[model samples]
Target chain A: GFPIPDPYCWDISFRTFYTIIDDEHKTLFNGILLLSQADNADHLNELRRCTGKHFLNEQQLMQSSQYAGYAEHKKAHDDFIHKLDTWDGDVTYAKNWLVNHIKTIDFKYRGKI
Target chain B: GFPIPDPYCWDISFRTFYTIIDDEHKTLFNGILLLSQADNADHLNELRRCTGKHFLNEQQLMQSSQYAGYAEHKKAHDDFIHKLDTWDGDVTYAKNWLVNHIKTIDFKYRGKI
Candidate 1:
C-alpha cells in the first residue's frame, strides 16, 4: 500500500538574511574550525553533543530573556537540535549543522540582543 | 577583497518532518498544479502576489484563532511571504514556496487542529 504522504513540509526563511555563496563559505569555515578543534574521535563526539546542548541552552536563554523573535527563534533551535540528535553521518551532519547555525542563530544573534 | 562574509545564513529545519523523497514529490506536484491553473503571464503573476497575501491572511487568522503554535507559525508564514514578495524568478520561486508550504504550514496543520 502506498504510504500516506507526509503531512509535514520544511521551509528555511534564513535565506532572507543570506545568500547561497555566504552560506557555503560559512559552512566550510565553521565546519573546519569545529572539526579541527576536536582533539580526537571522543572529542569530536563530545563536540557534536555539545552542539545540541549549546543550542538548547541558547533556546532557554532566548525564552527567558523574552527576546524579540524568541518563539520562532527557539523553534528553529529546537528543530535543528532534534535533527542533530537523530542524524548519523559524520562530518556531513556537522557541516550541515554548522551551516544552519550560521544562518539561523549566528545571523540573528550576532551582536544584538 | 574578502567579502565580509555575509553576516547571515540559511537553515531549513523542515527536514525533520519529511525526507528527500517526500519533499521532491511535493515540490513537483504542487508546482505543476499551481502553474497549470494559471491562465497566462498576468494570471501567473497575480497568483504569485496572492501567495503572499493569502499567507498574511493565514497569519492573521492563526493569531486571532489562538492556535498553539501561533507565534512561531505566524513567523514562518511572515518570513516566507516576505521572500515571495521579493523573489524575482519565475516558476522556481513558486516551486520553492510550495515545498516550504508543505513543510511549514501543511504539515503542521494537516489535522487535529
Candidate 2:
C-alpha cells in the first residue's frame, strides 16, 4: 500500500499562512503611518527606532520557513519601506497613500482569500 | 382615457432616495480625533495623518457604494478610529488601534462586503 500524505498538513500550513500574512499586513499598515508621519528632523530617528521594535515583534510571529506567508508578507513590508524612502517627506501624501493603499488594495485582496 | 404609469420610469427616476445631511460621519469621526488628542503633539500628528487618510478613503468608499454594510461598517471604523484619536497618541493605544482595526473592522466589516 502506498503511504498516504498527511491530510491535515495543508490545513495547518494554510492556517499558518493566513495568520502570518494577517499579522504582518496589520503591522505594515500601522508602521507606514507611524514612520511616515514622524514630526520633524527627529521623526526619522524615532521612526527607525519604532520600526526596529516592530520588526522584532514581527519576527516573533514569522519564524523561519514555518510560516508560508513569510516571503510575500516580507515583500509587502519592503515595498512600503521603499515607498517611504522615496517619499519627499510630505506627511499629507504619505498619510493619504497609506490609507488609500490599504483601502483600495490591501483590504480588497485580503478580503478575497 | 386610462392613465398609464411607466414601470421603467421607477427604475430610472423617482425610486431613488436622497438624504440631505450626507451624515458626514467619516469627517465627523476624524474631527473628534483631531480635537480630542490635542495634547501630545507628536502622537496627535501621527494619529491625524493616519486618520485623515482613513477618512478620505472611507469617504470615497461611501460615495461609490461599493460595500453593502457601508453604514454599519462606517460606524465600526468610526468607533475604533475614534478610540485611537481619543488616546492622546499613546503608542500603546495607537499600536493596539492599528492591529484591532485590521482584525475587527477591516477583516470583519469590510471583508463581509
Candidate 3:
C-alpha cells in the first residue's frame, strides 16, 4: 500500500507499515491479490507454495536473530497456512491476512535483525 | 492506497481519491497489484483481460454521462492498454501506474455526474 494523501479520513493511528518485502513475500502478496479478484486456483497454489517457503525462511531469520515472539509469529503462520490451503475462493481473507501480518507481525522484526 | 500518518511525513497534496469502483475497476486494480508484486504470467493475462472489460465499461460510463473529458480519459485508458499488452514483468511500473490513476486521473471524474 502507498501513503495516504489527504484530507481523506486519515485519523492519526499508531499503525506502522512494512510494505512487505520485494522478494518472496511480495510474490505471495500478488498471488493473494489475484486470488481475491478472481477464483484463480493457480494463484491459490502459488500462495501456498510461497507461504511455505517464506515462512520457513522466516523461522530461520527469527531463530538466528533471537526474536522473542517467534513462537507466536509462527502460530499466526500456522493458522494462515491452513486457511490458504482451504482458501474458499476468497481473496479478501488472504489480503486481510497479508496486510495484518505486515503491520503487526512483520513489523516486529524491524528493531532486531 | 490508504491514508498517511505521522511523524511519518504527511503532506497536504491536492490529490483526490476514488477508492476505485469495486465492481470492475477494483477488479482491475487487484490484477495490477498482482502484476506489480511478481512476474506472474497468469496475472499479466488476467490484467489484460480485466483492462479490456473495465475500459469498455468505463467508456460507456463516460459517454453516457457526456463527460467533458471523455476523449482525454479514453486516451489515457488506451495508452494503458498498450502498456498492459507489452508489460515487461515490472510490478513496480504497473503498481506505480495504478495508484497514480487512483489519485490523479480517476480523481477527476468525481464532480461530474
Candidate 4:
C-alpha cells in the first residue's frame, strides 16, 4: 500500500461549498489517510463504514434539495463501494478514488446541494 | 484522470541504487506525469512504448545480474503493462502502480542489480 502525500493537509481547496458535505468529505479523507498510515485491516473496515455513512448522508441531502444528479451520483457511489470491497489492501487506489471523486464528481454538486 | 500529488518531486528517495535503472524509473514517472497533465492519447501511446522499453531494459539487467527474483519481477512487469493497456485513461492507477512498484517490487533488486 502506498502512503498518501499530504495526508492531513485537506484544506479549503477540498471544500464542497457546503459545511455538511465538506465535513463528511474531510472525515472520509481522514479515514483514507489513517488507513494509508497503517496497514491495519481494521482501519480499512472503518474507512469503508464511514464512506458508506457519508455517501448515504450526502445522498439524502441531494434528494431533499432535489439535485438533478442524485441518481447518477448514487450510482457512482455504489460503484465506488463495490470497487472498495474488492480493492484487496490497495490503499493507493482508495486514496486516488477519494481524491478524484472530491475534485471531479463531488464538485458537480457545488451549490446544488 | 486523477492528477498525481507532487508530480515533479521524484528525488533521492526514489533512487533504485543503480543509475541506469533510476534513470529509466524517472523517465517512466515523467511519462505518467505528462499524461496526467494532458489528455492526449498520443502521450499515452508514448508512455506505453517507453514503459515497454524500460521494462525490457530492467529485465535484461536482472537477467545479466542473475537476480533470483527475475521471474517474479518480469511477471509483475507484464501484468502492469496489461493493466496499462486496458486502463481506459486512468492516469491515477498508472501512477499508483508505478510508485508502488518502485518502492516495493523494484526495491527488491537494490544491491543485487
For A42-113, candidate 1 gives per-residue lDDT tens digits of 443344444443445455555665778777776775675455445444554444555565565557754444
- TM-score winner between candidates 2 and 4: 4
Candidate 4: tens digits of C-alpha lDDT, residues A32-86: 6656666676566656776888899889988888999988889989998997787
Better DockQ candidate (1, 2): 2
lDDT of 4 by residue, B43-111 (tens): 666567768988999999999879999999999999989977886778777777887888889888888
DockQ of each: 0.01, 0.02, 0.03, 0.01
lDDT of 1 by residue, B10-108 (tens): 124333333433444333344335554653656445555655555565555433323345577767767765654565445544455555665656566
Order of models, best lDDT first = 4, 3, 1, 2
Candidate 3 C-alpha lDDT tens digits along A1-113: 53332211111121232222323454454455446445766556655766787788777877988889999999999998988777686555566667667667877777675
Q: In candidate 2 chain B, what residue range of length 10 has the lowest lDDT sum?
A: B7-16
For model 2, the superposed segments whose C-alpha errors exceed 4 Å read A1-113, B1-39, B109-113
Which is the better candidate, 2 or 3, if ranked by TM-score?
A: 3
Name the regions of candidate 3 deviating beyond 4 angstroms: A1-21, B1-113
Per-residue CA lDDT of model 3 for B1-113, tens digit only, reads 64322212111131233212323444455465555445577667666876787678767866877999888888988998998787777665665666566566766887673
Winning model by DockQ: 3
TM-score of 4: 0.47
Over the stretch A16-86, how does candidate 2's per-residue lDDT look in tens digits? 23443432333333333444434454444434443444445554455543555556656765675665556
Deviation from native of the Cα of residue B71 in model 2, angstroms: 1.3
Worst 10 residues of 1 chain A by lDDT: A1-10
Candidate 2 residue pairs in clash (backbone atoms < 3 Å):
none
Candidate 3 chain B worst ten-residue window by lDDT: B5-14
For every model shown, the clashing-pair count is 7, 0, 2, 0
RMSD of each: 19.2, 21.7, 15.8, 16.9
TM-scores of all models? 0.30, 0.30, 0.43, 0.47
